[PDB]
Symmetry: C4
């Protein structure tokens, strides 16, 4: 009955065109391509209907046939203009310059959206599968760790541990970290909340966390070098993914070569006295 999925998402049901811009960036690429295509056809229909609205003014076109007009409208709106289907007199030539204004316009738009919904990057940060409470520097510290999956660095990265106990009727406690901030994050970061007299989970234990039905949330944010742009990430845990007394395994091996390396294979390994 977790309020929060591992992926940081919420499990609350919400209850309730008017937000086009947002929606446009939001729909599955399948759907997006669809809509664009539809608007593409519809306008050409309109235009080709406007060419018929006057006496057929386009040359090399069958009489009253929309098939021809629609296709002239397309060749005309997309600036191919072979030269078979061609305008006639003032009326056609005007609808043409007007259609073209629209073509050029529609591109600007279509492109603007493409770019808007293209350049939203992911942090590419990995979260540890589990959380561990154990002694660090003489205090039962609760910690979790994250790693940068890419070569390029995230800079001025900051992370937030956040308890969500139940109590009445829901507490949102921002947990104090030994280090909330890292002016740069390129390999691995083990974030830790020392449990002390001000910690909410102070004196707390497993049975008491389950009783509060407490869950923990991680908010990562930073500015990715690769994108010269800001990025974020979430992840959530529950009392049943906290290894008590566990210690994370060292991810830095020294190679036979002698050169130091990072081994993301040990990233989820956790040591425990049994």
């Amino acid at each position: 009955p977790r309020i929060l999925n591992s992926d940081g998402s919420s499990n609350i049901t919400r209850l309730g065109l008017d937000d086009h811009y947002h929606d446009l960036l939001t729909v599955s690429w399948p759907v997006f391509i669809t809509l664009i295509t539809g608007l593409y056809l519809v306008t050409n229909a309109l235009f080709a209907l406007a060419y018929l609205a006057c006496g057929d003014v386009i040359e090399n076109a069958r009489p009253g046939s929309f098939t021809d007009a629609f296709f002239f409208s397309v060749q005309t709106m997309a600036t191919i203009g072979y030269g078979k289907l061609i305008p006639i007199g003032p009326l056609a030539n005007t609808l043409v310059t007007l259609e073209a204004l629209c073509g050029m316009l529609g591109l600007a738009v279509a492109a603007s959206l493409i770019y808007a919904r293209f350049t939203r990057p992911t942090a590419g940060v990995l979260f540890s599968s589990r959380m561990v409470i154990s002694d660090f520097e003489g205090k039962p510290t609760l910690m979790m760790r994250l790693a940068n999956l890419r070569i390029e660095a995230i800079i001025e990265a900051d992370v937030h541990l956040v308890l969500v106990r139940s109590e009445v009727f829901r507490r949102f406690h921002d947990l104090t970290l030994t280090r909330s901030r890292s002016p740069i994050f390129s390999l691995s970061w083990t974030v830790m909340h020392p449990i002390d007299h001000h910690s909410p989970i102070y004196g707390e234990t497993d049975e008491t966390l389950r009783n509060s039905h407490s869950e923990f949330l991680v908010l990562f944010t930073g500015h990715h070098e690769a994108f010269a742009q800001n990025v974020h990430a979430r992840h959530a845990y529950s009392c049943d993914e906290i290894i008590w007394g566990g210690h994370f395994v060292d991810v830095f091996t020294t190679l036979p070569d002698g050169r130091r390396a990072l081994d993301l294979g040990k990233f989820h390994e956790i040591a425990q006295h049994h």
Copy 2:
């Protein structure tokens, strides 16, 4: 006589091409489309005038008729180039490559503006219709609440309560909140200023707020997930939209299903002992 509308706007009359870029992003889409269209026509007129400036150099064109030239200029600037109206000799062919440089250029521009004035997103945050001062955790706290209307989260969101009392001759007091910051805001947030000995509105009452003719302003800001981009929102209240002793109604229902839900229907409901 409120200085501030509910929507956060100001009621002060201000007294006073030189700011083109701003203006361009600012005018109603109707007007914007207009201007672009105008510049579109005018240049073609210029160009078509430049084609006439030399002996008619374009083929299949009536003599001295601008109608033909203007339309050749359009087919030429928009790169349709059917092949009926076609250049001749050095002069025409040059104006052509020059016109085309301009077409391609004008698109880049037109598009750049489109995109600039397209990708300014709204926060899609709802503000509570009323403000309520009542006891919270043993102190007369003044509070108001806001909700995220979309699925996607706003992150590192922060809100500001701000008093605007009259006194001489106008005070701008930033009110201290129990929580100015939320590393994430996806459902509902009830912002609260505990009234204590440092509160400006400390000891204050309704009649005294009206006497100061005090108003309150809310500034919301955050970084929207949906847009990977920053967003803001304003809202303002007055002494006559503060329910004294009111309590906001809980917006989280637990469904018969057993799953928890958010009910924005109760968002404006406020309980009051009578």
Copy 3:
């Protein structure tokens, strides 16, 4: 001999293609348009030379004449393609698809720069012409003021007063303000540094400021609503633009109408007991 102009610029002479991107955004629009145009011509020359590099493969072209080729190259790179000058066999048709890849490419680029060097907005903030040191709330406060010239608001705006005394050999002191931050700035802001025992200019006087040959710098920054984008501004003063004992004149008139107004006409007015 001011180190700093009113406009915040520096008067230090600096002593010393390798920075293309920056340069490209930096050069006068005249120059920018030029460069683009040049690259436009040069490539077409190259391409038209590549069409001649094979036997004339383009139809309706004079033999060996580059004039024809260059113009075919343009009609071809800009996708007009009338249909007079047309390709022949494998070679021409290939250079064509290759040229077109380049056309489409060059646009993307040209546009990208246009947009990059277009969407750098100005804050549109006015700085007061003079600075005044005088009593505010029982302390000789040094202050200056700025105003938002546009309707749209700047949000989370912050300002910095900064002394630049000479002493050996140059001090950079960030002056403490009564209010460094304004969660919103839509009309007028009077920024003030109370002179107290920690103020650098504490006990200081005019003759002593001139002796230190001290100057003051203002850094404004905020996030403009109009552009959904960040903006900045600078301005600098000198000891000979500080009215001692001066008071800024109130910029808010109440209209005969009864409605309150902002009068930027009084913005530079400063009252003084004589």
Copy 4:
């Protein structure tokens, strides 16, 4: 055996299509242009295959020859449309409007990437070649300096000194600076960590730094005026590029002219009593 190169890069070996967007921005321009070109050809092959998939419907084309189709597909997808190779009946004309949707689309994309991987600017900040520990204002201060190579200013710039001692097993200490922040950085900045009882390198000496095999990292960040966009920079030192007792040489000459100047020639000069 430095963990960190002068350029701020790491020397850790990492151990391990699924990240297309990132990759696309990441690959050498040579490679990028390649991929785009490939996708350009492949689709045309597909389309030209779709034109053959029906009876040759394009006019002026040899039977079953893909050469013709592929080239018609290109003239058609890139909107040149000479008018030699032209469609026929419903089928061809449809694939045409469909191809064109794709052309226009592919541009939007190609461009979006171009722009994304174009507008990632460099700070253009120079780092001093060496670091020096020596007395400043009565305390052994460790300092290094950086300079703005361009005319345009970086604003709200901040720098971080960061020790990386070995100890078990690696310490990441953020060193306290006399000035971590500069609301503007246009010429030269000498950043300094006073060594006091809280300094990690307090009481430390050269032999002891080498023994800890300590290295130092500099993180620069700010918002460049030239780009109206955020920028960063890194640089790293080692115990063998710290001149003990060294003093940086003054970079500001006063010209014979009388005007003050900045001389980046002395930027790396360091004075030392011998």
